[PDB]
Amino acid sequence: KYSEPLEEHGNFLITVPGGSDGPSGVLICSENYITYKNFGDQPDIRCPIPRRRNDLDDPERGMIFVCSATHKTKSMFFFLAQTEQGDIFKITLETDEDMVTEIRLKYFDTVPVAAAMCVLKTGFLFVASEFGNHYLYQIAHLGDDDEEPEFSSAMPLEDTFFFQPRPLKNLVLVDELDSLSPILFCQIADLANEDTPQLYVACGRGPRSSLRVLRHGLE
Amino acid sequence: MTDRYTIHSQLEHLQSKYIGTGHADTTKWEWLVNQHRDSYCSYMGHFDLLNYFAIAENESKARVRFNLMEKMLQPCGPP
Amino acid sequence: MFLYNLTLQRATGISFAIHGNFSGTKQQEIVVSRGKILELLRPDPNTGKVHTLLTVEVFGVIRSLMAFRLTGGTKDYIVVGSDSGRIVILEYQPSKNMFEKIHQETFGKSG
Amino acid sequence: AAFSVAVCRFSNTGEDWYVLVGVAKDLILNPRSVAGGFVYTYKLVNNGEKLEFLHKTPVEEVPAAIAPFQGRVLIGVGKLLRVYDLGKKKLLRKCENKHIANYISGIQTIGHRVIVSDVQESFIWVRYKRNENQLIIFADDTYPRWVTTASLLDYDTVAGADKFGNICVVRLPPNTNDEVDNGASQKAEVIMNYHVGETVLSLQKTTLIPGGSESLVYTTLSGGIGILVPFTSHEDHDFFQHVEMHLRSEHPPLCGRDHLSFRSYYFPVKNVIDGDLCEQFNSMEPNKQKNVSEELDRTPPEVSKKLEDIRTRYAF
Amino acid sequence: RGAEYVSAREWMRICFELLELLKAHKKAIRRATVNTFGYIAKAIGPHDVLATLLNNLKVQERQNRVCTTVAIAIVAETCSPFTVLPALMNEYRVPELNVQNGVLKSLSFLFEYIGEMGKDYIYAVTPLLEDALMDRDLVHRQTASAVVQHMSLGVYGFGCEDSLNHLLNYVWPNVFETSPHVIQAVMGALEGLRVAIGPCRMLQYCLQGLFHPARKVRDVYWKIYNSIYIGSQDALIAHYPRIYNDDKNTYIRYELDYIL
Amino acid sequence: NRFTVAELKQLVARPDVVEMHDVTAQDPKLLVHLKATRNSVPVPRHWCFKRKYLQGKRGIEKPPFELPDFIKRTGIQEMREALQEKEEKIDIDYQKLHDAFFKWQTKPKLTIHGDLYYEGKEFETRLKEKKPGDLSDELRISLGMPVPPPWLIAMQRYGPPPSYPNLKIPGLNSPLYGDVFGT
Amino acid sequence: AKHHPDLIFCRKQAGVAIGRLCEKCDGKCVICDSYVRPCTLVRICDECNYGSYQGRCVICGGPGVSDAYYCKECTIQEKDRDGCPKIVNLGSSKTDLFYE
Amino acid sequence: IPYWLYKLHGLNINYNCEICGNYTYRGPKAFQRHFAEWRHAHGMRCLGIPNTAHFANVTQIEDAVSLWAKLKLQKASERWQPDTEEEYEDSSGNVVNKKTYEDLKRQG
Amino acid sequence: ETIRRQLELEKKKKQDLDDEEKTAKFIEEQVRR
Amino acid sequence: ECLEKKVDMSKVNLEVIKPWITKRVTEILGFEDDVVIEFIFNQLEVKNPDSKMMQINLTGFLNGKNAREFMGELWPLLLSAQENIAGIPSAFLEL
Amino acid sequence: DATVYVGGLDEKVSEPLLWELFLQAGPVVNTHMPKDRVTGQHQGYGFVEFLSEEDADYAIKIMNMIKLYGKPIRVNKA
Amino acid sequence: SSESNRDRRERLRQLALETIDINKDPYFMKNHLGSYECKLCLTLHNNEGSYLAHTQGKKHQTNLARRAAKEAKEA
RNA sequence: AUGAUGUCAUACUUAUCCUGUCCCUUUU
RNA sequence: AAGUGUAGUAUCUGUUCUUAUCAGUUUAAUAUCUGAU
């Protein structure tokens, strides 16, 4: 039906819900960019990915959308997207009468390296990481009514909007699904003084290190 | 445009339509490119293989996915 | 050396994830897809505890997981993309607590 | 950047259990890095609670292994096996072997032989004559495997994982010419083959629940710990085989994959009974249970008891 | 159904009469004759039926001639193959090329019909197949390749790797051949071996032929490689060896060398 | 255009597997890199032959079939010969055949993965390593010696053998066991 | 086929249709060309059955009676997951037989 | 005059064997036999070129020396000579060759 | 003929059951220690 | 060849090239034919046509030399029209 | 000098047995025991061309004492 | 017919063996695949006729006269 | 002392195959 | 003293290259073939 080149290669796509709820279109994330280029005569709206203010990371290293979820509501619709640094940003699609007005981004919270995100009903956010225990937070703040700024696609820059990260202000950790993942090594022996041998299993990824001394029982 | 090169089909021969089926006049660059592409696709397929390959670097799963999808075009070199 | 495979602890890592009312009721379920096992979770709304409602070994390489909800329905299907060339659309069966294969269609070869 | 570590005593030294840790400088994921290698000689004294890297012998390529052998330190410098002796300045390379193919990925020290697992090649058993101080490749493997871990099963049996998600067990034959002086002369057979499903990286099967039979505990990169145990009865093996053959058609998977294909993805299956598919008899439907009991000539509770017996005898 | 009112001598006479019914110009008649021979074998016993079938001098090689071999396989599937195996092995000692080819075809059909039951007869069927692999006649090699295909399809997962390798040792030289029947049988046997013996050994045996100089050798090796690559598309990653990197090409998959 | 065979052998890492027909190939470097694999199987000797790989056994008078002991000890051959003699029934046993096919089943001598069947492959009775002092029992039997050999004393008078400098003889140099008479 | 090597299989994309085989070719394997050990069912192509092309025999090409299935030898060999095995060609067989 | 046999069997094919004493061979199989024969054997022996696989089908007398040199222990025949145990330092000095080890064992 | 192996199979099954009972008793005695 | 450059028939008119192509066909083909004119007109109907298929069709209808002439007459005129900001060549303005 | 003849044996001796017997003393490079095609029996005499003259002389001097098929197996230069 | 065919084949084999014995030909040899081979002609023969027909063409007796003269120099 | 050539006979294999139709051409 | 047809394979019988060279196609290389002395 349609073919549309882009400026640079992309990494992920997210379908903006259309019909009676929201407009049609597909927001494509790419290296240090997020572009909303819907169908028809709608124009392309761009928004660069923020970065941490005075971040010690490498400048040559870009940023890509690791994963994204959408909270579809009858009133409006927002998206929660995790970056390579785990900073979960809140994308809002400023829509005109019949076209896209601008892409409103805001620092939602700081989350781990996110492999998947599901925004369920009753204000719950299940964030599963590529390594380490899972996470299930309680969506308390809706992203607004705070002192955090909203970077919009209409806001020019030349230069990227530096991000002011902070702890979990809009989410509360309700539980943590252990799920001991990458077991780099293992030693099954009676390292303790007991007869029931313990399984010393190391798993993690850098800061997520954990030397779990597994024991066959129930806590 | 006097070329006279109408390579479509002759008598319904074998004509390997599979991607990477292999042939007789396959140069070393062709076999190497097919092998590299198949290996990249396999690394993109196996979840545990992706975890073991990306667990080396500090990059995330999406980092490895993008680096693999980017290396698909011209992995070996321009023949 | 005729060995016998015994899985003591299933895989806890999550490779794919979907969220929807797959149970057919007002409760919202979370379908997680590990490397070689699928799971359905129904965490406590009030207690906030995540209980493994169901866990089934897929016996395959789950490569993609996308949900489905027909027009005018109240129960979501489960599209299971595997390494085999068989597209599978399963449906929950809480009355029996088993994943029912609603449809299965072959597409191509294996691997 | 570290790659391997170990702790052992030196023959020339007394009870000073030295901690040898190998690391590499200027390394890279791309195929264009080596720079140099260093083997810091940790002291680890003060009632085993005080490390001290006195010696710092530099390596050649990228070190990835260190083990003891006859009191000396067998280390892997790329495609070289160096049996060094703990000296004053650096580990004096008392013997060298240059028969390695690609890179020393694993080194298992047997009482007299040594199992070297390469990155691209399969395991190779090499005998180290101490009188002449010479290592000689005793045999090799037929099919290759990207070995990530290894375990010494017996005096001639060695088990090894695969980077492609496989677990194999190679047993040397009785006719292995331990005394020596397509690729190599002596070859070995594959005695075990089974698709683990997830990339395994650790295998030290020993004794789990005290009072039970020892087994091979295997880990997985996706967070799974399984246990492989042997069938101590030919009748039990036949019963398990009939159960698997019935379950392959009675309660197949939902993903449409075949058990023979799900188990033989990278390499074929070789004497491995998938107990995970066998566990579905408890969850199988009643008609399926009755059909299985008829095909097996036993009761469905009989099959349940037979399945629970293995879990009780070989596991916790 | 009944198999009771028919007497032993009555069953023998019925078999001697049905032996002549195989000369018809129909296929359904032959299928029904094979089924009836199998029923009579299940009723009376294996010895007399196998003895009556072994006398097939095969006047014509067509007109349901192999049908005797199909009936032998049906009797082996209905009766104990422990009884039908050595009698067939002894009947294979005859000098006639017709009888030898018939024994080979019957063994192939019996292995194919048995399938999982062949987990024990592999070591017993190995040496006869290895001896017949010697290409004294094209029909012998064709029957050999067919038996190898049936055995590889039937021995899937039963643990017959040694017999598979021993059969491949003699089946590999059959790749060079111009016979259409022989070529088709060799291709089917290669497919079966890749199914059972595994694609790793198949590629290890077909590796050197890929970049060969000749036209015919390169063609045969490329056909074998295309057959091995049609399936097992996922397992071809590991079997792909490490080829050194040239100047303007980096073919070595360095990511595979990533040591965790 | 075409590289020299000597040049390809000098540039090759394992030139012991070089062939004369490889110089006119399309990618000789790739062929050399492939032929020096670990478990690589070569092409057969029919690449240059002209007998169709089956026209060799012209006059070889071969036997009908060498059945195994598992079948030979079952008595089917004798019964078949008796039936042929009477024609040109027995009911010997069935549990005996069951034990023969299940219990008395022998694992024959298989072949290695690279066992390519050559043209003749019959007159090539090779030996692994017949070191000095290790031979067949037939030699000592024909010699009729009891349970070192008579030839080890000659090395004392004449001196150690020239071709085997690493030989260690029994009694004098190596302080014999069984039929083995060397080390 | 082994009986008709000059035949051309359809190799079309698979559909949701179940095929049938002619009574004369009842039980014959579609691919393996065997007569025992069936594993999977035969799927027809979308264009392979539309009106007059509906209800025809897969191999025989005639009016079908029984539902066919793939041979287990073809299923274990990863052969049953191929394209539409409809015999589109009809040559070198039953050509001059009408003249006789 | 079986010229059919002469053309089919590979006869009437000239070949020069410098390794086989600069001899002539009227066929390709004849060339393979002349490269590996008693005449070529004596030629390589008097020339100092021992028999081997890669040194079998060689013709030029120059490349044979290069093959014999590169194959003359490409990377081998080095067991170990760091064993000295230079106890003069005993904490950071212990580097000396095996020849120096024997020299210290003999002299001091 | 199969009935003979069936009787022998049942005898072997009873023997294996007795051996498993003895092994379980021994393991229980060890666990008591 | 001149037909190797990518063109776009959407960015140019069609009535300006109709009678020129008709006259070229009447001169090369000699007689008056409607199948050739309609085929040439429908050939340039797509938004991103291909000159190779058009040349093949012209060679099939024409002799092959006249086909080359027609290709080399239609390619550059269409290219110049697509290059014109108004969308026509220099001949459409002359008369 | 490298070639030698060895006789004094019965039909019990053959090619590979004689080769294995020679290899006990020195490596038999190329042995040949011409068997008469008419009767199909061992002539009791063979010719062995060793690797060089050293092993040939060594076997002729020291190895000329074995006895195949009971009779003495001498060795002589050739 | 079929049994008559086997009887005719047996009678033909008997007649061929009788002819070979009357001629005292050494070349005719029965193969392990139920065939005949002429070692003198160094050829094969499917039926008995092809084996008995190795006397009109390929007169290798002249080529055997060479070996006859090589074994004995005297005429 | 292998082979190439091709009228003319011969054995073999494909579990090859005997009621197959104009149910579809109805153009002037 | 009975077999019908559809495709393919081998073993049998009869014939031919002492042509010295050059170039090309083709061959793994020969061979064969194509033009000149």
**Residues of D numbered 218-247 whose beta carbons fall under 8 angstroms of chain C's beta carbons: which are they?**
220, 222-231, 237, 240
Nearest CA in chain D to I14: D235
Tell me the C-alpha distance between G58 and G44, whole Å.
8
Cβ-proximal residues to C86 (8 Å cutoff; 6+ apart), any chain: C104, C105, C106, C107, D255, D256, D257
Nearest Cα neighbor of J8 from J58, J40, J44, J37 is J44
> Max alpha carbon distance in chain B (Å)?
56
Name the DSSP class of I5: H
Question: L30 and chain E: CB distance < 8 Å anywhere?
Answer: yes
Closest residue to N29 (CA to C1') is: F21
Q: Which amino acid is at J92?
A: F
**Residue A184, H or E segment:** strand A183-189
Q: How many separate domains does chain J show? A: 1
Structure tokens at K33: 């025991």
Nearest CA in chain K to F123: K16
Sign for the CA dihedral angle at C55, C20, A173, A164 comes to: positive
- Backbone region of residue A109 per phi and psi (left: phi > 0; alpha: psi in -120 to 50; beta: other values): beta
Sign for the CA dihedral angle at E30, E36, E42, E46 comes to: negative
Tell me the C-alpha distance between K35 and K42, whole Å.
5
Task: Verify that F54 and F1 share a domain, yes or no.
Answer: yes
**Residue E18, H or E segment:** helix E8-18
Nearest CA in chain D to H80: D95
Nearest Cα neighbor of A90 from A73, A106, A70, A112 is A106
Question: F89 and chain D: CB distance < 8 Å anywhere?
Answer: no
Give CA separation, L61 vs F31, L58, L67, L68, L72, in Å: 49, 9, 10, 10, 16
Find out whether K73 and K7 touch, Cβ atoms under 8 Å.
yes
Give CA separation, B54 vs A67, C89, E253, K76, in Å: 17, 31, 15, 74
Q: Which of the other chains make 3 or more beta carbon contacts under 8 angstroms with chain D? A: A, B, C, E, F, H, I
Cβ–Cβ of A128/C17 closer than 8 Å?
A: yes
Structure tokens at J93: 């303005």
Q: Measure, in angstroms, how far nucleotide M21 C1' is from residue B8 CA.
A: 37
Q: What angle do CA E30, E36, E37 make, to 5 degrees?
A: 90
Nearest Cα neighbor of C29 from C88, C98, C92 is C92
Q: How far is A11 from chain C (nearest CA, A)?
A: 16
Dihedral Cα C87, C91, C96, C97, nearest 10 deg: 80
Q: How far is C84 from chain D (nearest CA, A)?
A: 6
At residue H43, φ and ψ (nearest 5 deg) are -65, -45
> Max alpha carbon distance in chain A (Å)?
74
Q: Are strands A162-163 and A51-52 parallel, antiparallel or unpaired?
A: parallel
Do C and B have ≥3 inter-chain CB pairs under 8 A? yes
Closest CB from D89, D133, D134 relative to H95: D89
Q: Which amino acid is at D305?
A: K
Tell me whether residue D219 is exposed, middle or buried, using C-beta atoms within 10 angstroms of its C-beta: 0 to 12, 13 to 18, 19 or more: buried
Contacts for C54-59 with beta carbons within 8 Å, 24 or more apart? C54/C97, C54/C99, C55/C10, C56/C98, C56/C99, C56/D254, C57/C10, C57/D253, C57/D276, C57/D277, C58/C33, C58/C82, C58/D253, C58/D254, C58/D255, C59/D253, C59/D254, C59/D255, C59/D257, C59/D259, C59/D262, C59/D276, C59/D277
Cβ-proximal residues to G72 (8 Å cutoff; 6+ apart), any chain: E115, E153, G37, G38, G39
Find out whether H28 and H46 touch, Cβ atoms under 8 Å.
no
Could you identify the residue written with the tokens 């422990």? E82
Name the DSSP class of G45: E
Check if residue F23 sits with its Cβ under 7 angstroms from strand N: yes
Closest residue to M16 (CA to C1') is: G3
Find out whether J29 and J36 touch, Cβ atoms under 8 Å.
yes
Tell me the C-alpha distance between L75 and B4, whole Å.
75
Name the DSSP class of C11: -
Q: Measure, in angstroms, how far nucleotide M11 C1' is from residue E218 CA.
A: 33
Give CA separation, A89 vs A46, A47, A115, D195, E252, in Å: 16, 12, 15, 41, 39
Tell me the C-alpha distance between E106 and E4, whole Å.
29
> Max alpha carbon distance in chain I (Å)?
49
Closest nucleotide over all strands to F23 (CA to C1'): N28
Q: How far is I10 from chain F (nearest CA, A)?
A: 17
Cβ-proximal residues to E169 (8 Å cutoff; 6+ apart), any chain: E130, F111, F112, F115, F116, F117
* Three-state SS sequence of chain D: CEEEEEEEECCCCCCCEEEEEEEEECCCCCCCCCCEEEEEEECCCCCCCCCCCCCEEEECCCEEEEEEECCEEEEEECCEEEEEECCCCCCEEEEEECCCCCCEEEEEECCCEEEEEECCCCEEEEEEECCCCEEEECCECCCCCCCCCEEECCCCEEEEECCCCEEEEEECCCCCCCCCCCCCCCECEEEEEEECCCCCCCECCCCCCCCCCCCEEECCCCCCEEEEEECCCHHHHHHHHHHHHHHHHHCCCCCCCCHHHHHCCCCCCECEECHHHHCHHHHCCHHHHHHHHHHHCCCHHHHHHHHHHHHHHHCC
The whole-angstrom distance between residue C62's C-alpha and the CA centroid of its chain comes to 9
Residue J70 maps to which CATH number? 1.20.1390.10
How many residues are recorded in chain A?
219
Nearest Cα neighbor of D156 from D111, D221, D117, D199 is D111
At residue A92, φ and ψ (nearest 5 deg) are -125, 130
Nearest Cα neighbor of D84 from B31, H83, E44, F14 is H83
Residues of chain J found within 8 Å of residue B1, distances taken between Cβ atoms: 1-4, 51-52, 55, 68, 71
Q: Is E114 helix (H, G, I), strand (E, B) or coil?
A: helix
Check if residue L62 sits with its Cβ under 7 angstroms from strand N: no
Nearest CA in chain E to C1: E159
Q: Which amino acid is at J29?
A: L
Q: Which amino acid is at D116?
A: V
Sign for the CA dihedral angle at A23, A29, A32, A38 comes to: negative
Nearest CA in chain H to F51: H9
The whole-angstrom distance between residue D303's C-alpha and the CA centroid of its chain comes to 32
Name the DSSP class of A97: S
Give CA separation, A183 vs A116, C9, C39, E222, in Å: 21, 12, 21, 43
Domain of F106 in residue numbering reads as 59-110
Cβ-proximal residues to C47 (8 Å cutoff; 6+ apart), any chain: none
Name the DSSP class of K41: B
Tell me the C-alpha distance between J81 and G6, whole Å.
53
Could you identify the residue written with the tokens 């492959």? F121
Question: C20 - beta bridge partners?
Answer: C29
Check if residue G96 sits with its Cβ under 7 angstroms from strand N: yes
DSSP secondary structure of chain J: -GGGS---GGGS-STTTHHHHHHHHHHHT-S--HHHHHHHHHHT-SSS--HHHHHHHHHHHS-SHHHHHHHHHHHHHHHHHHHSSSS--SHHHH-
Tell me the C-alpha distance between I28 and E153, whole Å.
47
**Residue E74, H or E segment:** helix E67-78
Tell me the C-alpha distance between E218 and F34, whole Å.
14
Sign for the CA dihedral angle at I20, I21, I23, I24 comes to: positive
Report, in angstroms and rounded to the nearest whole number, the Rg of chain C calculated over CA atoms: 15
Residues of chain F found within 8 Å of residue H63, distances taken between Cβ atoms: 6-7, 9-10
Q: How far is F14 from chain H (nearest CA, A)?
A: 8
Q: Return positions of chain M under 7 A from a protein CB.
A: 1-4, 9-21, 23-24
Tell me the C-alpha distance between J41 and B58, whole Å.
60
Domain of J49 in residue numbering reads as 1-94
Q: Is H99 helix (H, G, I), strand (E, B) or coil?
A: helix
CA atoms within 13 A of residue G64's CA, in its CB half-sphere: 21
Nearest CA in chain B to E210: B24
Structure tokens at F170: 């029994």
Sign for the CA dihedral angle at K15, K21, K22, K28 comes to: positive
Could you identify the residue written with the tokens 């005993």? H90
Question: C111 and chain E: CB distance < 8 Å anywhere?
Answer: yes
Q: How far is E239 from chain B (nearest CA, A)?
A: 10
Q: Are strands C3-9 and D272-273 parallel, antiparallel or unpaired?
A: parallel
Tell me the C-alpha distance between A68 and A76, whole Å.
17
Tell me the C-alpha distance between E3 and D298, whole Å.
29
DSSP secondary structure of E162-231: HHHHHHHHHHGGGGS---HHHHHHHHHHHHHHHHHT-HHHHHHHHSTTTT-SSSHHHHHHHHHHHHHHHS
Tell me the C-alpha distance between E130 and E128, whole Å.
5
Structure tokens at C31: 């379908």
Q: Measure, in angstroms, how far nucleotide M6 C1' is from residue G6 CA.
A: 27
Tell me the C-alpha distance between J87 and J81, whole Å.
5
At residue D93, φ and ψ (nearest 5 deg) are -70, 85
Tell me the C-alpha distance between F134 and K28, whole Å.
15
Tell me the C-alpha distance between A4 and A25, whole Å.
13
Do I and F have ≥3 inter-chain CB pairs under 8 A? yes
Tell me the C-alpha distance between K70 and K52, whole Å.
29
Tell me the C-alpha distance between D116 and D135, whole Å.
12
User: Given 3-state DSSP classes, what are the helix, strand and coil percentages for chain B, each rounded to the nearest 5?
Assistant: 45, 0, 55
Q: Is A143 helix (H, G, I), strand (E, B) or coil?
A: coil
Q: Are strands A77-82 and A67-72 parallel, antiparallel or unpaired?
A: antiparallel
CA atoms within 13 A of residue E170's CA, in its CB half-sphere: 26
Tell me the C-alpha distance between D247 and L8, whole Å.
57
Q: Give chain H residues 1-60 with Cβ within 7 A of strand N.
A: 1, 3-4, 6-8, 10, 12-13, 28
At residue H53, φ and ψ (nearest 5 deg) are -85, -60
Q: Which amino acid is at H59?
A: T
At residue A179, φ and ψ (nearest 5 deg) are 45, 65
Nearest Cα neighbor of F76 from E84, E81, E57 is E84
Q: How far is E255 from chain C (nearest CA, A)?
A: 21
Closest CB from F37, F46, F110 relative to E162: F110
- Backbone region of residue A137 per phi and psi (left: phi > 0; alpha: psi in -120 to 50; beta: other values): beta
Question: F136 and chain E: CB distance < 8 Å anywhere?
Answer: no
**Residue A51, H or E segment:** strand A51-52
At residue H25, φ and ψ (nearest 5 deg) are -145, 130
DSSP secondary structure of H36-96: SSHHHHHHHHHHT----STTTS---HHHHHHHHHHTS-SS-----------TTTSSS----
Tell me the C-alpha distance between E106 and E129, whole Å.
12
Tell me the C-alpha distance between D42 and D53, whole Å.
4
Give CA separation, D46 vs D17, D49, D51, D149, H92, in Å: 11, 5, 9, 32, 22
Cβ–Cβ of H89/D90 closer than 8 Å?
A: no
Find out whether G81 and C85 touch, Cβ atoms under 8 Å.
yes
Find out whether H15 and H31 touch, Cβ atoms under 8 Å.
yes
Tell me the C-alpha distance between A108 and A143, whole Å.
6
Q: Give chain L residues 11-50 with Cβ within 7 A of strand N.
A: 41, 43-46, 50
Question: F135 and chain K: CB distance < 8 Å anywhere?
Answer: yes
Tell me the C-alpha distance between D56 and F47, whole Å.
57
Angle, helices J65-83 vs J18-28, to 10°: value is 170
Dihedral Cα H22, H26, H29, H33, nearest 10 deg: -30
